[PDB]
Design a protein around this ligand. Structure first.
Ligand code: FES
Length: 106
């Protein structure tokens, strides 16, 4: 499944992620800039924050309270598109998924 990461300045990164991996790993394991992933996907740092593209938001599973609670600690979260990538699992049907990276991670 191809995952597309777009930095805030508009630089496009494309990665081929195997189903089962998380979006966070897809970016981390492939050297995509903008994702810190400090807690390693334990949904405790929120430094894997990103804005899912409006066109795909409805195709992802909805966020659980544990995740939503942690997004409020991310850098400039968006109630509509913000998500923690470590909480989104790649699946073949998400081939072509587009994610926009914030300017900073906290
Ligand atoms: S990488 Fe720590 S919250 Fe996702």
């Amino acid at each position: 499944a191809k995952i597309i990461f777009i930095e805030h300045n508009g630089t496009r990164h494309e990665v081929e992620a195997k189903p089962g991996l998380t979006v966070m790993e897809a970016a981390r394991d492939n050297g995509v800039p903008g994702i810190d992933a400090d807690c390693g996907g334990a949904c405790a740092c929120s430094t894997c924050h990103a804005y899912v593209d409006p066109a795909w938001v409805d195709k992802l599973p909805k966020a659980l309270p544990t995740e939503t609670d942690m997004i409020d600690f991310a850098y400039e979260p968006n109630p509509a598109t913000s998500r923690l990538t470590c909480q989104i699992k790649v699946t073949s049907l998400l081939d072509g998924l587009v994610v926009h990276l914030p300017e900073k991670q906290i």
